[PDB]
Amino acid sequence: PRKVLQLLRLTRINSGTFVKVTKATLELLKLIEPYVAYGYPSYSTIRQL
């Protein structure tokens, strides 16, 4: 899981990135599940970020 977090550029607490959803990235999210919170962002959230 430590390696997967580095590959997603999540190297410190409260860091965030966008991920495109495919079969290759869904399995990545499974490995780091107890370390992250993720969901589906709306247009308003993307604009303000």
Partner: protein, 159 residues
Amino acid sequence: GKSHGYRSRTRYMFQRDFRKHGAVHLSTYLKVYKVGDIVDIKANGSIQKGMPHKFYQGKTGVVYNVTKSSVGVIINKMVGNRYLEKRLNLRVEHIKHSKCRQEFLERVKANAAKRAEAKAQGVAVQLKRQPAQPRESRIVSTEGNVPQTLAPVPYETFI
């Protein structure tokens, strides 16, 4: 004391398959191997000569030498913190052609065919594989498929 002989711990690894004892079929000896071919190693317990060590069981390598009844195979082995090149002399009974790349050859052929087909009229032939994509929208009809309600069942012993 401890025992670390050449064939140590190979009780089940080198056994023949169930109801598959006896002589080797002739198709093993009729296949041709060339330098640069990719082969995988699986020892046969009934041929005691030219047999690989147990470490190389289930490994894949590249042919570098061809002899009368055997081939030379190159294997990369991890020792310590690096990889060392190992060269094996194995009889053909213990090897077979690998399909890890034979399936890759046809994709190269199809890419050339698709590139030439769209060369005269098409742009962006898109010769790249892509992972499985999220499903698109759809409409589910209930005509003849009215949903059936389900509920949890009570505990029963039925021993």
